[PDB]
Every structure is written in C-alpha cells, then in structure tokens.
C-alpha cells in the first residue's frame, strides 16, 4: 500500500447545490476532499443537507471540516459498502492524506502502528493535583 | 457549489454593485471615502431633526439635529479608523490595507461632515 | 397565663371571633327559605361552628391577643399545666405510625432480597406477604429495639460501597 | 384470573387502592370527629 | 387500479390478561424488567410510541385506529358527566326562568373539613360552584328545557362510550383492517367531507329547524319553559309549527319546486345579534348549517374511488410543477400515505390554528343566548381555545421533526419541494432570525421608550394618541369596510356580521353584550408584540425541523435520533441540539406569546366593551384606561396585574376562596419547576449516592437502583411544571376577577 | 408568626449548607466520577455517558447554592 | 488541543475507535489483554471533545479518558 495522490479533475456527484457548503475558511485556512469509487449510480444524503446522485466510477466532494468528510464516509461504508478516502487541502496547494492513515481502517488492528498517549496504569493510580502544581502551566495529573 | 439564485447571480444586480464607490476599483481610497461619507452624512441629518428632543422648537430644531448628526459621523469615523488598525496589521485592492484604510477613514470624516453641513444649508 | 397567654374560655377576642363567623353565616341564611336545602346546610354549618368554639375552650387551650389558640411544645410546660395533648402526646402518636410504616416496608424489602428476582417483586407487589407483614408491624418498637441490641440492625462498614477519598 | 390478579398487584394499581383506602379512612374520621386540633 | 374495498384479518390478537402482568412487553428493551428506576420512566415514555415498537406499518396503523376509539370513548364519558351533572347537581331549570340574574352552577361539594364554603350563593335557591364552561347557554340554544332531557343525553353518552370501547377492542382483537385499507385516502376524504362534516351539518340543521327554532322563539317571547310544547309535539303537529312559522303550512313542496324564498321566515340572513338574548339569530344559524351541508356534500364527490369519475390526488400533486421549484410536489403522496407523523404534523398545525380562530369568532359573534353578558364565560372560552390551539401548533413542529428524522428517505426526495427547502435552510433561518430581531426592537423597544420618557417627565415624547401617534390605519379601514358591507357589497344582509366593526351597542339585562371596538396607538403596539412573539416561535420550531437531520455543528444528527440530550461538551458544547429540544424551547415561547394574547383580550374587553349600561351611558369595568395606560410596561404592571389581582388575593373567606388557594399553589409549582430547569442530573446522582448509603447502612436499600432522572426527563419535567404553574396562575386570576366583577 | 419564619430560615441555612458541603466533600471524586480531581474545580461536564453528568463539578455545586443563598437572605 | 489517554485496563473491544467521529483513535498490537490489541490516540489534534469514545468503553472505570484543553479551529469544530 502506498499513499494515494489526489486527482483534482475527478468528477463530482450530481448535486444542485445548497447554502450549507464551503465558506471563506476554505479560501484562507483549509478544506477537505473525499473521493471514492461507485459501482452504480445511486442517491445518497449530503452531510450538508439534501440528496445527491453519485456517478458510476470515481466521485469527489469538498467539505468544510473533517467531521463532515468522516460522516459521509460512515454512510458510504455502512449502507453502500464503499471504501472512501479523504484528504486535507491547504490554500497554498499542499495536499495531506488521512483516513486511512496506513491504508487499513483504524478499527482493524494492523502491525507497524506505534501506540500513542498510552498510560501503563489505571485511572485510579494518577497522582494528586497538588503534585503537579506550579509546573509552568495548568497540567492534569494524567499528563505526567 | 453555492446555491445559485437570481439575487446572488444576476446581471442587472451585479452591474449596479460594480458602480458603487465601495466596489469601484481604480479610485484612490481617500476619494472613495469622501464619496461614501457624503452620501451617509447627508442622510444622517434627517431623523435627528424630525424626531429629536428639540424637534418642536422652531429654529433650534434644525441646528440641534444637524449638530447631533455631525457628532455621530465623528463617532463613526473613529470606528472606521480603529477597525483598520485591528484588521490590517501585517490584497488586490489598495483599500484593504493598513495604508489604504487609514486614508479611507480620513476621507469619510471629511465627506461625512461636509454632507451634514450641506444638509443644513439646504434647510437654511 | 403561659408566655402572657390567657385561656380561650376567658378571652374577650376569642368570644368576639365566634360572633363574627356566626354573623357571616346568618347573613347568608336569611336569603333562603326555612327548611330549603340551602338553609339546612347553613344551619348544619352553624352547629359545627358553635361546637368547635365550645370544644377548644373546653380543651383548655391558650389564646393570644389575636384571640386564636396557641400550642405549647415544651414537654415540661405541657405536662406542668396540662397541655400534653397539643404537641407532646401527638408526638408519640405520629412516631408509632411513622415507625410502623417504615418498619413494615423494611421487613418486606428484606423478605424479597432472598427471592430469585427481587426487582420483579417490587414493581409487582407480593400482596399475601405484604398483608402478613402489615399486621406484624404493630409490635415494631419491641422488634426494632431487639434488633439494635443484637447488632443486626446496621450493616458492616466493610460491606457498604463508598467513593474514593 | 391469575394474570388479572397479578395485574391488580402492580405498583400503580396497589397505590391507587391503598391511597383510596387511606384517604377514605381519614375523610371518614373527620366526618364523625370534625375539627380535631388537640388530642384531649 | 387497486379496488377500494373492506379488508380485515380475523382474530389478529388474543384477548388475555397475560401481558397486563408483564410491563414493558411492547418493547424489546424494557421486556427484561427493571434494574434501575430509569426503567419505570422509560415504560411510560415509550408506551404510545408505536412506530418504535415495530417496523411494520400495518401493525402501527391498527394500534392507532383502536387507540383512537379509546380517545372517543373517554370523551363520551366526559361529555356524559357534563350532561349528568347538569341534570342532578345544577340550577339549570331555575336559570331558564331568570337567566340574567342567576349564575350557572353544575358542581356541588360535600360538607367535609369545612370545604362547604365553596358552595356559594349562585341563585335559584341553590348553592354550588359557578361554572364558566358555557354549557347552560349551549343547552338553551338546542332547546333543552328539563333535567329529564339532560339525564337522557347522559345515559346515551354512556352507551356511546361503551360502543366506542367495544369498537376499539373489536377492530384490534377481532377484525383488524389491513394496511391497504388505511391507504384509501381518496375514499376517506369523500366520506369525511360529505359524510362526517356534510351529513353532520345537515342533521344538525334538522334539529335546529324542528326543535331549536320553535323552542327559542317561545322562550324569547317570555313563555314559561314548562308551558312550551315538547319537541316531539312540534315534530308531529304541523299545525303548531305553522303558527310560529307560516312557511310550514306549505310542507316540503317549496323545497322541491325551488320556491326556496317561501322559507324566508325561518331561513334568514339578518346578521347581527338578537336584541332580546344578545346572541346570533338561530334562524341565521339554521341557514348557515343548511348552506354548509350542501357545500360539503358536493365536496365529498371530488375524489375517484371505484367508478372512474373524480380526481386522483397523486395526479393533482404531480401536475402542479413550475419553473422555480424543480420537480415540484412529486413524492408528497407517498410521504403522506406512509408516514403517520407527517399526517399528524399537518393536522395538528391546522387543528390548532382552527381552535384559535374559534376563540376570535365566538367572542365577536356570540352564537348562544346570554353568552355575551356572561363575562366569565366569554373570558374563559376565549382563553381556553387559545391555549388549546397553542399546544397543538407546537406539537405540529414536534411531529414534523419526528418525520424528518425517522420517516424521511433521500432516495424518494430528490430535487422536489421538500428537498429544495432543506438546501437553503440557512437562508430561511438567517432571514427569519433577522425579522425577529427587527420586530423585537421596533415593538418592545417602543414600550421601553415610553417607560423611560414617562419616568423622565417627558410625556409629549411618548408614542401615544396624545403624542407621537401610531394609528392602525389598515385595520381601521377594514373595520369601516365591513361596517358598510350591507349597503353595497352584501345587499341581502340586513346587518353587519359583528358589532365590533361599528354601529350601536346591544345591551341585555343592563349589561353590554357587544359594541364597536376602536383601535388606537396601544392596539397598534400590542399587535406588533403578537407578530414578534409568533415569529420567534416559528423560528425555534422551524429551525428544529430544518436542522433535525444535520447542521454545520453536528453533521450526522439524524443518527443520534430525535430525542437525545447532546453530543457532549466538545466543539465548545452541544447541549440541546436535538429537534426534541427545539420543541422544549418552543413551548416556553408559545406560552410567552399566548399569555400576552389573553392579557390583551382581558384588558381590552373590560376597558372598552364590557360594562353596565345606564341612563348617562356605558361605564366599563376598568373605565377605559386601556388607551392611555397600556403603552408602558409600568401601565401593565400597575393597572392590569396589580389592580385586577385585588379580587383573587381577597378571596379568602368567600366562595371564591378556592381560586386564592390555587393562585398561591400555581405560583409554587411554577417556581418548583426552575429547580429542574436550572440544574443538571450530575449533582442529583451524587446526592442520591449519599442518600443510598444511609439506606444501605440500615439494610433498607431498594433492589431497583435509584437513579437521577435523565437529562431529557429533567427538561420535560421542568417545562411541564413551568407551564402548569404559569397557566394555572392566570386561570385563577382570571376567574376570581371576572366572576367577582363581571 | 415568628416561629414559622425562623424555621424557614433554618431550612435555608441547612439546605444552602447541604449544597455547598456536598460540593466540597465530593469535589475530589464520587461514584459517578471517581477521578473528578483530575479535571479541576470548574469544568462543563463528563458528557452524556453513564447516564449524564450535567453540573457535576464542584463549581456547579456552588452555582446551585447561590440560588438558595438568595432565597434564604 | 484536547488530551486523550488510554489506560492499561483496555480489553481491545475496538468500540472507542468505531465511536469516534473524527478518526482520532486506532487499534495497535498489544500483549496485555486477551484480544492482544490496545487503543491508541495518535491524532488528538483532530479531537473535538465529544466523548463518544468514553460512552462506548465497557471497562469500569473507563480505559479511555478525554481531558478538554486548549481550544482551536479544529477542536472547536468550526467550518468557518
Ligand atoms: C429542645 C430543648 C428544650 C428547651 C430549650 C427547653 C426549655 C425549657 N424547659 Mg424543657 N424539656 C425538653 C426540651 C427543652 N426544654 C425535653 C426534651 C424534655 C424531656 C421530654 C423537657 C423536659 C422539661 C421539664 C421536665 C421541665 C422543662 C422546663 C423547661 C424550662 C426551664 C428549664 C430548662 O429546660 O432550661 C433550658 C433547657 C435545657 C438546658 C435543655 C434540657 C432541659 C431539661 C430536660 C429540663 C430541665 C428542668 C429544670 C431542672 C427545672 C427546674 C425548675 C424550674 C422552675 C427552674 C424551659 C422553658 C421546666 C419548666 O417547666 O420550667 C417552667 C421543667 O420543669 N423541660
Ligand atoms: C405539617 C403538616 C400538617 C399538619 C401537622 C397538619 C395537622 C392537622 N391538620 Mg392540616 N393540612 C395540611 C398539613 C398539615 N396539617 C395540608 C398540607 C393541608 C392542605 C391539603 C391541610 C389541610 C387541612 C384541613 C382542611 C384540615 C386539616 C386538619 C388537620 C388536623 C387533622 C387531625 C385529624 O385528622 O385527626 C384524626 C385523628 C387521627 C388519630 C388520625 C390518625 C389515624 C391513625 C389510624 C391513628 C393510629 C394511632 C396508633 C391537624 C391539626 C383538620 C382540622 O380540623 O384541623 C384543625 C382539617 O379540617 N388540615
Ligand atoms: C386517552 C388515554 C389513553 C388511551 C386511549 C390509551 C391506549 C392504550 N394504551 Mg395507554 N396510557 C395512557 C393513556 C391512554 N392509553 C396514559 C395517560 C398512560 C400513562 C403514561 C398510559 C400508559 C400505558 C401503558 C404503560 C400501556 C398503555 C397501553 C395502551 C394500549 C392498550 C390498552 C388496553 O388494552 O386497554 C384495555 C382497556 C380496557 C379493557 C378498559 C377497561 C379497563 C381500564 C383499566 C379502565 C392502548 C393503545 C399498553 C400497550 O400495549 O401499549 C402499546 C401499555 O402497556 N398505556
Ligand atoms: C369527567 C367525568 C366526571 C368527573 C370529573 C366527575 C366528578 C365528580 N362527580 Mg360525577 N359523574 C360522571 C362523570 C364525572 N364526574 C358520570 C359520567 C356520571 C354518571 C354515572 C357521574 C355520576 C356522579 C354521581 C352520581 C355523583 C358524582 C359526583 C361527582 C363528584 C365526586 C366524585 C367522587 O369523589 O366520587 C367518589 C370517589 C370514588 C368512588 C373513588 C365529582 C365532582 C358526586 C357529587 O357531585 O356529589 C355531590 C355524586 O354524587 N358523579
Ligand atoms: C378486557 C379487555 C381487553 C384485554 C384483556 C386486552 C388485552 C390485550 N390488549 Mg387490548 N384492547 C381492549 C381490550 C382488551 N385488550 C380495548 C377495549 C381496546 C380499545 C382501546 C384495546 C386496544 C388494544 C390495543 C391498541 C393494543 C391492545 C393490546 C393488548 C395486549 C396488551 C394490553 C396491555 O398491556 O394492557 C395494559 C394497559 C392498561 C391497563 C392501560 C389501560 C388504558 C385505558 C385506555 C384507560 C385509559 C385511562 C386514562 C389514562 C385516564 C386518565 C388518567 C389520569 C386520571 C391520570 C393484550 C393482548 C396491545 C397488543 O396487543 O400489543 C401487542 C395493543 O397494542 N389492545
Ligand atoms: C336531516 C335533517 C332533517 C330531517 C331528518 C327532517 C325531518 C322532517 N322534516 Mg325537515 N327540514 C330539513 C331537514 C330535516 N328534516 C331542512 C334542512 C329543511 C329546510 C329546507 C327542512 C324543512 C322542512 C319542512 C318545511 C317540513 C319539514 C318536515 C319534516 C318532517 C316530515 C318530512 C316528510 O314529509 O317526509 C316525507 C317522507 C320521508 C322523510 C320518508 C320516511 C321514511 C321512513 C322513516 C322509512 C321507515 C321504514 C321502516 C322499515 C318502517 C318501520 C318498520 C318497523 C316499525 C317494524 C320530518 C320530521 C315537515 C313537517 O312535518 O314539519 C313539522 C315539513 O313541513 N322539514
Ligand atoms: C393528537 C395529538 C398527539 C398525538 C396522537 C401524539 C402522539 C405522540 N407523540 Mg406527540 N405531541 C402533541 C400531540 C400529539 N402527539 C402535542 C400537542 C405536542 C406538544 C406539547 C407534542 C409533543 C411531543 C413530543 C415532544 C414527543 C411526542 C411524542 C409522541 C409519541 C409518543 C408519546 C408518548 O409515549 O406519550 C406518553 C405519555 C406520557 C408520558 C404522559 C405525559 C403526561 C403530561 C406531561 C402531563 C401534563 C399535565 C396534565 C395534562 C395535567 C395535570 C395532571 C395532574 C396529575 C397534575 C406519539 C406518537 C414523543 C415521541 O417520541 O414521538 C416520536 C415525543 O418525544 N409528542
Ligand atoms: C425578558 C427576558 C428575555 C429577553 C429580553 C430575551 C431576549 C431575546 N431572546 Mg430570549 N429567552 C428568554 C428570555 C428573554 N429573552 C427565556 C426565559 C428563554 C428560555 C425559554 C429564552 C429563550 C430564547 C430563545 C430560544 C430565543 C430567544 C430569542 C431572543 C431574542 C429575540 C429577538 C431579538 O433580538 O429581540 C430584540 C432584543 C430585545 C427586545 C432585548 C431588549 C432590547 C432593549 C429593550 C433595547 C436595546 C438596548 C439599547 C441598545 C441600550 C443599551 C445600553 C447599554 C449598552 C449601555 C432576544 C435577544 C430568540 C433569538 O435569538 O432570535 C433571534 C431565540 O431564538 N430567547
Ligand atoms: C410573498 C412571496 C411569494 C413568492 C411566490 O409566490 O413565489 C412563487 C414561486 C412559485 O414558482 P413556480 O411557478 O415554479 O411554482 C410551482 C408550484 O406549483 C410549486 O411547485 O415560488 C417560489 O419561487 C418559491 C420560493 C419563494 C421565495 C420567497 C421569498 C420571500 C418570502 C417573503 C415572506 C413574506 C411573508 C408575508 C406574510 C404576510
Ligand atoms: C332520512 C329521512 C328520515 C326521515 C324521518 C322522518 C320522521 C318523521 C317523524 C314525525 C312524523 O310526523 C310527520 O308525518 C306526519 C304524517 O304525515 C305529519 O302529520 C301531519 O299531517 C297529518 C296528515 O294526516 C295530520 O294527521 C297530522 O295532524 C299533521 O301533524 C307530521 O306533521 C310530520 O312531522
Ligand atoms: C430534583 C431533581 C432531580 C431529583 C428528582 C427525582 C429523582 C425524582 C423524584 C420522584 C419521586 C418523588 C421519587 C419516586 C417515588 C416512588 C414512586 C415511591 C412513592 C411512594 C409513595 C409515597 C407514593 C433530578 O433527578 C434531576 C435530573 C435532571 C435535572 C434536574 C433534576 C432535579 O432538579
């Protein structure tokens, strides 16, 4: 598995449009692009409101925040049994790929992943807040 | 994309906006400030004169109302100035810059007060 | 008398209060017939009003300057001057009933904890058991004390869940 | 009939009968002993 | 071409008490029994949520149909009780003789714990609670003259109640209609238009023509009620009817020969109010129901069922297709024949709006004899039917959002009217948001302007009739147009429909029944308060429906459901995002808006309409202080709430003392509700932990684990107590006031 | 008349103390949130899980107690 | 950015990962439980603080904990 490269010329579903789409943020900070393959033309529900028809073959959509992309991904996987993937696109033209980070959806365990933010203790074994006081910033006992 | 609509996308509407001082590019920000300030300043005198606390006084009503319209233009000019200070601290149009907006605010004050004074002269 | 109060039987304001209430009833009476249904009802009310004011005076209550009965709560003052029936005696009257209700409910709750499905015995009451426990509760003060002395009234501190501290 | 008597044993039905009985007893006592304020 | 036919299933369900002894049987989740107290609340909350018990539409429809028979059976018991209590515990017979001096009463209390003082002196040698339901006026209009007639109706009411409960059992356990039966919308409309409304109107016209009109004609003439002919004597003896109405001498030949003008003596078009009784002419009311009967019977032959002729409702919807709306009304027919919630959303909306229209028309055109001069009945009926309409409309929003979450399917809705509305919801809510802000400033800000100018000693600067004026010129023009209608635009009408438009007052028994209502600056200001508070209620409810499925905050709100508390403290906090919470908030604003409506009505009537007629003129209850005082918030506080609450707070020791008690008790329930609204279950679950510890210490801890109410139930308990306390407070204040002075 | 009012004042003092005292003794944790100390004195909630935890912090106990203080005074 | 911590009582049910509406969590190999897998939080910069993961954790007390911290455009869930 290798990191996919986004194709900006991918066709988009048949959608009239709505007022729930991108705002000025997309032009200044970032936006998100989700792409997938469709076996047949079908009607799905846009997370921004309304219904759109997915073309047979590749499809591409642009959303304002990550949660909107992953909300559509859940719908496509659960009902239509598709395998979408989405990116983060910056105004400068850079494209960042994510979900699936390594090509396998996170629900399935995969070798090569490195545990992060894992504490080898229980919640009840954290230190008291007094012992992490005056540490330069508000710090919870869980952080240390 | 965005929901197309005649109000959002129509030829007649677009041409009208493109001729307004705010959208008429190629004009110095100061001159646009004067043109905008004059229009608002002239109108601003109306409500103060007719519905102010001294509206029923024969001759003082005109003076008091216009003098209050001049005051509001001064407050608005301050709002324009500080807005430029906060917004532009670091693009195509010169107006949306620290240098451009400061000239724009100055023109609004000059135009606005001129409009208020011009409105008074119309009455007397 | 006590705390500056006076017996209601000797209170001028108390007597005047009775006349006011009877006068109000009499005023409504004279707009009806002698033995019509409304007239009979009003006369019945007046009889109860006269009986009520005689009973409170006969009970030896104390009336204030307002001319209304006041109750004595201190056990020493109550037993000293024969006001035990106002608060003192009713105090032990209520506690017997309150302990009766609470003790009966506790007995039933313990009884069903031994059953296979205690939760279904709480929404759907076991009426035969409840009636059995209802009658045996008359001796709750005796049974309650004996549990206390035998040490089976309270749970052990080690068998009760508590939050981290 | 077993199920019907089980329905009457449900909490809402028992409470209605119990409070109907309890209220009736208190109402009847005050009907024959009106205006009780002191044990006497 | 599926034929319209009767279709049922035999013995679908067995009649047994087995499931009566197994609470929660209807739901898979609750069938296992309780482990925590939360189970108990869940049992009652989901009892009537049929759509969630089963996914079968046929099973859902059958439960709805029989649950409706139970509702009908309950109304008949209630109606039977009202007729029975009129026969046995009322002064109706005495009231017929002296309607203007005797107060209606149909409830008597037992002499226990000293409550017999509530049996007030109402007249006719009778003691009882004065009623404001208007049943005496209704019975007189229909021609009831004895308690025997009231008694027979009550017995008939119980027989109908028994029939309704049998029908519900029969059509669920014995012969349950199939799903295809329920989906004959064309057939149902035909029967309900021509059969329910149409024949119902014609049948009632028969009663009025043959019973109400003769009886009320003699009652108004002064004949003693006991000496009036019985209704069957009027029916059997055409000679008697001819004396009262000569048209009866010609029989029914004029009807079939089209000489309908022969019936002009009892089918009139007078308009106005009957001077003797102050209510609408019954001859006018009979011609109304005869005209309405024909209109609905014609209306019931519009839809096609089995014989070709008629309209297909699907075809009508699909033909109405324009350039601005894409596909159009396509797909609505399938929505409205497969979603009960969608049907309920429409019907609640219009049924509630109808109840509000009833309130306005009944006060302005009093339809019963002696209804107008009974100010307690006028105030109660207007206020009752406004509250009923308010709750129904809020329900319409609730069940529109339920449809949006559960029954909405994007595949069936693509580019149709419904889809396009969802695709510019931000445009709709943003514009409606601005309108509410605009209306709040320019209506309530005027009151704040007046209050400040008045406190500063600048009355000449206020918005009022003696100062800067705001005249409802448009409303005043309409009042004048309707006043002159009989001259040119309604030539065959003798009088204007109402005396509110203009003219002369009608006085019955020395009291004003109705007189022209003048609209001034205060009326201009209060009306734009109504528009403000109504528009805000639309904003809250419409926002909930349009954003039920998703928003820019929760992109997948549909999966969370219709009734959930939040999506957690993330994204800054998402408390109360569900569409259920938009009904919860909408209830407060509906209560706020209708409270001003019934305060506006109460003060305007007492100030400008109601009063006592004397030689000099009309003296009103509050003496015409609405015009000068209702333009400031201080005026409402002092002149309306503080002054008129004198009656309720002085009620102790009289027959109205009950209203005083409920006035305090209502204040209590309202304040009690703020405990649930201002707090959260996190505090209460920890409090119960310490309380449970004490019970554990004494071996008296319950087997069903105590739990603090859920988040949603806290909001539901809060709003229910808030509404009950607030509404009951006004209820006590209105009745103790109007009964005392009115 | 003074008897009834004084006992209402006692209700105010005891209930206000109850709310404040619970907010302090449960500040460090509880069965519904054993590790409340790790979140601080003032936080919104722990989410809708475990039945719902609105107004569970010690800050919220003080917030509810201010109402009872105003009522008592 | 919020703080998300996984504690050693995890049983590797994967319910937290499925629940997360922003793909913040993932499963990694482990030897401390029967399932031989543990939850991980490699992408906490995308966490919004909904606490759907905590709602889904079966262990008592929770094995995944979210401590709301500094706010940002991503953690505040803004599309503008
Ligand atoms: C709730 C607390 C309380 C309070 C404030 C009072 C107050 C009073 N009691 Mg009462 N009393 C109470 C509870 C209380 N009592 C209880 C629970 C009982 C047992 C059921 C009694 C039994 C009782 C008796 C038998 C007598 C009083 C008497 C008195 C008065 C003076 C002595 C006294 O008690 O001083 C302050 C109170 C206390 C410090 C609390 C304990 C009081 C004990 C139980 C009684 C003391 C009696 C005293 C030795 C009598 C000496 C003669 C006296 C004339 C000076 C006073 C009005 C006396 C009286 O009638 O005086 C006119 C009296 O003879 N009380
Ligand atoms: C703190 C609460 C409280 C208290 C202490 C009382 C106490 C009393 N109330 Mg009041 N009341 C209350 C709240 C309270 N009320 C409320 C909230 C309301 C509004 C609903 C009323 C409305 C009310 C009315 C309308 C009346 C009373 C009356 C009474 C008396 C009833 C005596 C009786 O029934 O003996 C009956 C005797 C018994 C022994 C009853 C118990 C029976 C068991 C089986 C005994 C077992 C013994 C072993 C008594 C003085 C009556 C009265 O005359 O008061 C002066 C009366 O008419 N109350
Ligand atoms: C207008 C009032 C009304 C009506 C018509 C219904 C109708 C119904 N309810 Mg509901 N219910 C109501 C109010 C009402 N309920 C209220 C106020 C509550 C409290 C929140 C409930 C709580 C409730 C529960 C908990 C259950 C029902 C159930 C039912 C269904 C079966 C009832 C039955 O067989 O009765 C038979 C009636 C008679 C034989 C009449 C004579 C006997 C009665 C007791 C008098 C039916 C659809 C049951 C069901 O299956 O729901 C799906 C059920 O389990 N209801
Ligand atoms: C909406 C229905 C409704 C309501 C709210 C009431 C309410 C009332 N009725 Mg009425 N009643 C109704 C329908 C209703 N009734 C019907 C349909 C009938 C015909 C059978 C009657 C026949 C009836 C009689 C015969 C009497 C009442 C009486 C009463 C009063 C006392 C009830 C009581 O405590 O009984 C006791 C409570 C239980 C048995 C439990 C109360 C105001 C009584 C009354 O007003 O006496 C002065 C009375 O005597 N009612
Ligand atoms: C004695 C006759 C009888 C019997 C034995 C049954 C038995 C059954 N019915 Mg049937 N049913 C009957 C009569 C009967 N029904 C009638 C008369 C109707 C017409 C309304 C229906 C309509 C009906 C429906 C629509 C359904 C059933 C269902 C059921 C099953 C469960 C019912 C249940 O749990 O009820 C227990 C419920 C109660 C005791 C609540 C009684 C509610 C009534 C309407 C009284 C309402 C009073 C009202 C709230 C008063 C105001 C309250 C306020 C003062 C507080 C069971 C097979 C259900 C089923 O089969 O599900 C699979 C079902 O969905 N029945
Ligand atoms: C639904 C409403 C309704 C009803 C039921 C009636 C009924 C009646 N009207 Mg009225 N009427 C109405 C509306 C109504 N009207 C309206 C809207 C108007 C205004 C246009 C009038 C204007 C009007 C006038 C002007 C007159 C009546 C009259 C009558 C009576 C005689 C009609 C007649 O000659 O029938 C003729 C025949 C029939 C209707 C057919 C009867 C069929 C029977 C019932 C069949 C029974 C068959 C059965 C098997 C036998 C029994 C067997 C068993 C014992 C074993 C009758 C009581 C007349 C009267 O007498 O007034 C006092 C009269 O003069 N009406
Ligand atoms: C024709 C009228 C109608 C009908 C048939 C329904 C039917 C339904 N509604 Mg809807 N609804 C209506 C009107 C109607 N609604 C109106 C007018 C409103 C606005 C207030 C709503 C608001 C509403 C909401 C917000 C919800 C529903 C829901 C439901 C469903 C479940 C209801 C349930 O289980 O209740 C069970 C019944 C109870 C628990 C009893 C409630 C008791 C109230 C609160 C008592 C109030 C005080 C009382 C009347 C007077 C004083 C009492 C005294 C003892 C002190 C069901 C399909 C629920 C659902 O899930 O739908 C899918 C839901 O969430 N409705
Ligand atoms: C008296 C209490 C009160 C007040 C004043 C408001 C005010 C408002 N609510 Mg709120 N609300 C309240 C109680 C109140 N609410 C309650 C108890 C609840 C819980 C049920 C809600 C629930 C609620 C919801 C759910 C909604 C509102 C909405 C609104 C807005 C309506 C439209 C608008 O902008 O009007 C104009 C504003 C006013 C009339 C406020 C007073 C303005 C004064 C009189 C004039 C301005 C002052 C002036 C500039 C001088 C300032 C000087 C100073 C700076 C020195 C408004 C901000 C709706 C909204 O946001 O619509 C857009 C909305 O959706 N409210
Ligand atoms: C008025 C506007 C009518 C508009 C009207 O009649 O339009 C008519 C037009 C209908 O177009 P079509 O002919 O294509 O419609 C075919 C129909 O059969 C529906 O499918 O409707 C629309 O374009 C819908 C959106 C209108 C958007 C209106 C925005 C302004 C709203 C203002 C609300 C004021 C309320 C005042 C209440 C007193
Ligand atoms: C759907 C249709 C439902 C129709 C229901 C009809 C019910 C009729 C009940 C009343 C019977 O009476 C109806 O017929 C009688 C016989 O012609 C009329 O009787 C009239 O004419 C008779 C002719 O010989 C005279 O003897 C009567 O004295 C006179 O009153 C009544 O004036 C009329 O009201
Ligand atoms: C007071 C309060 C509680 C506590 C209230 C509870 C637990 C409800 C209490 C209901 C009754 C009083 C308890 C159950 C009674 C039994 C049915 C037994 C009664 C037996 C006889 C006496 C009838 C919450 O749970 C809550 C939740 C969310 C927001 C606000 C609040 C809130 O304000």
Numbering used by the authors:
A (entry chain D): 53 to 196
B (entry chain L): 53 to 142, 157 to 190
C (entry chain F): 63 to 227
D (entry chain J): 1 to 40
E (entry chain A): 10 to 751
F (entry chain B): 516 to 588
G (entry chain C): 2 to 81
The authors write:
Being a multi-subunit complex, its macromolecular organization affects the dynamics of photosynthetic membranes. A chloroplast photosystem I (PSI) of green algae consists of a core complex and three antenna modules: inner belt, outer belt and Lhca2-Lhca9 heterodimer, which together comprise 24 subunits.
Upon symmetry expansion, the resolution was further improved to 2.74 Å. To derive a structure of the chloroplast PSI dimer, we first built an accurate model of one monomer using the 2.74 Å resolution map and then fitted it into the cryo-EM density of the C2 refined dimer. Compared with the monomer, all but two core subunits (PsaH and PsaO) and one light-harvesting protein (Lhca2) are found in the dimer. The first better-defined density is the Lhca9 loop region 132–153, which is stabilized owing to a direct interaction with PsaL of the second monomer within the dimer. As a result, the area is closely packed with PsaG, and therefore also the PsaG loop region 63–77 is better resolved in the dimer. The newly modelled β-carotene 622 is in Lhca9 and could be identified owing to structural stabilization of the interface region in the dimer. Instead, PsaH, which normally preserves a monomer, is not present, and Lhca9 with its associated co-factors acts as a symmetrical linker between the monomers, highlighting the importance of the light-harvesting antenna proteins for regulation of the macro-organization.
